[PDB]
Design a protein around this ligand. Structure first.
Ligand code: HEM
Length: 146
């Protein structure tokens, strides 16, 4: 139910995954500057220079497309989220709390750009909580508990 609820507000996101993706990552790096260093391709770019950066926006589109895939899935969520945990724990080396931070940012960007109301915020927080708990479980299976 909460996945379908978030989709009621996803139109403006999916309309421009690149622009909205850039807003998300720009705001993540501005509000949580330690996260920028977890992206070696972006680490060191002056904050004032992130909003206009096409590579940052392209990666934000990758992120939001993956969330859209999850939301729209009729099949296994596990088939989509387990690889995501595997890569983020073992390749990218991302501490789990960062996923909470990007979720906070997404809520704000959807409030501002996608008409996310109180019920929609609930739903989105619920969906992101499901995602984060699954990532954390799969991290633990790989030996990551930090
Ligand atoms: C909504 C949560 C997130 C989603 C859906 C997501 C999705 C993705 C996807 C689909 C990729 C492409 C490669 C892969 O499959 O691993 C990726 C790569 C990556 N992600 Fe995430 N991610 C999320 C959160 C984060 C956070 C919070 C960080 C760091 C703070 C992070 C850091 C990275 C890095 C460093 C890469 C590799 C970029 C590259 O070298 O091109 N991700 N992510």
């Amino acid at each position: 139910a909460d996945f379908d609820a978030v989709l009621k507000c996803w139109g403006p996101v999916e309309a421009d995954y690149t622009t909205i993706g850039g807003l998300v990552l720009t705001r993540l790096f501005k509000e949580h500057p330690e996260t920028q260093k977890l992206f070696p391709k972006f680490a060191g770019i002056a904050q004032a220079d992130i909003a206009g950066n096409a590579a940052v926006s392209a990666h934000g589109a990758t992120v939001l497309k993956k969330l859209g895939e999850l939301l729209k899935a009729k099949g296994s969520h596990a088939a989509i989220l387990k690889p995501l945990a595997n890569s983020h724990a073992t390749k990218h080396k991302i501490p789990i709390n960062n996923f909470k931070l990007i979720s906070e940012v997404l809520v704000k960007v959807m409030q501002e750009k996608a008409g996310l109301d109180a019920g929609g915020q609930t739903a989105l927080r619920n969906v992101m909580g499901i995602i984060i708990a699954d990532l954390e479980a799969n991290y633990k299976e790989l030996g990551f508990s930090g």
